[PDB]
Design a binder for this molecule. Structure first.
Ligand SMILES: COc1cc2c(Nc3cc(Cl)c(OC)c(Cl)c3)c(C#N)cnc2cc1OCCCN1CCN(C)CC1
Length: 261
């Protein structure tokens, strides 16, 4: 196969219903890549159009330092393979879990660094008239050696002015998207990013539904166990404002005083 011929598989680094991700060395350049290998989705299914959204997003998206670089995608032997940039820091989700294990944490400065960098990624995507629609720790990836946060997993990417919306994780989902209101989709990414940072700040696991789910959608910031400045807190707070029009845009976010620099 092209997979075996072009690459040497080093180790499986991720698995799940989405398939599996392998750390691979490309024989030609000797560089490390992350390759997702999954069953070729059923024609007409959500998994197909999910994969369609991923591959067709890079047709629009160029290279950006806060978006995981895409190299190629192909199908063979009833399997689909996507070759991406390898981020040696793994996902933000794993980093959060590792913090919990060894009792470390992200300092307030590091949290603002995370917000700004992913903010820069969102600004570019939005400027291409696209929206990510699934921003969460597991979809944020880390490159080190000196720390670069990159947006990955474009399986939910869709147009701004042509809304075809497949909802993302309910834990990060803005209420207006649930209400089938797609007039301000960029602000949905902003909403999810705030909760993503709140996750990195060491907050308890976000609710999938129920009471405290609604309280968050009311604009209530989840309890954070560490001391953040009231100014950073208020920024995160407005990012989850019930009115998406009061939430800052991505380009307004990256220009914000508390974040710079
Ligand atoms: C979770 O594992 C990793 C997934 C990564 C990843 N996912 C991904 C998602 C999707 Cl949806 C894709 O399909 C479009 C494709 Cl192709 C890849 C991208 C991307 N993109 C980039 N970088 C990653 C890096 C990872 O681990 C890095 C170090 C792990 N190391 C630590 C020491 N030890 C325990 C051995 C394992």
């Amino acid at each position: 196969s092209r997979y075996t011929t072009e690459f040497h598989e080093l180790e499986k680094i991720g698995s799940g219903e989405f398939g599996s991700v392998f750390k691979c060395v490309k024989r030609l350049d000797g560089c490390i890549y992350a390759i997702k290998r999954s069953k070729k989705p059923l024609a007409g299914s959500v998994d197909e159009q999910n994969a369609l959204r991923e591959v067709y997003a890079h047709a629009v998206l160029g290279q950006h330092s806060h978006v995981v670089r895409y190299f190629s995608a192909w199908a063979e032997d009833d399997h689909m393979l996507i070759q991406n940039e390898y981020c040696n820091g793994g996902s933000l989700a794993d980093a959060i879990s590792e913090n919990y294990r060894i009792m470390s944490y992200f300092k307030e400065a590091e949290l603002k660094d995370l917000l700004l960098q992913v903010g820069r990624g969102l600004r570019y995507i939005h400027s291409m008239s696209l929206v990510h629609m699934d921003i969460k720790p597991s979809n944020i990836f880390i490159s080190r050696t000196k720390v670069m946060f990159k947006i990955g997993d474009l399986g939910h990417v869709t147009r701004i002015s042509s809304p075809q919306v497949e909802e993302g994780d309910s834990r990060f989902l803005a209420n207006e998207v649930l209400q089938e209101n797609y007039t301000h989709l960029p602000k949905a990414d902003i909403f999810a990013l705030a909760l993503t940072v709140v996750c990195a700040a060491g907050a308890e696991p976000l609710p999938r539904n129920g009471d405290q789910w609604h309280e968050i959608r009311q604009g209530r910031l989840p309890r954070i166990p560490q001391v953040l400045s009231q100014e950073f807190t208020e920024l995160l707070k407005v990012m989850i404002h019930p009115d998406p029009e009061r939430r800052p845009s991505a380009m307004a976010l990256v220009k914000h005083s508390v974040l710079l620099s």
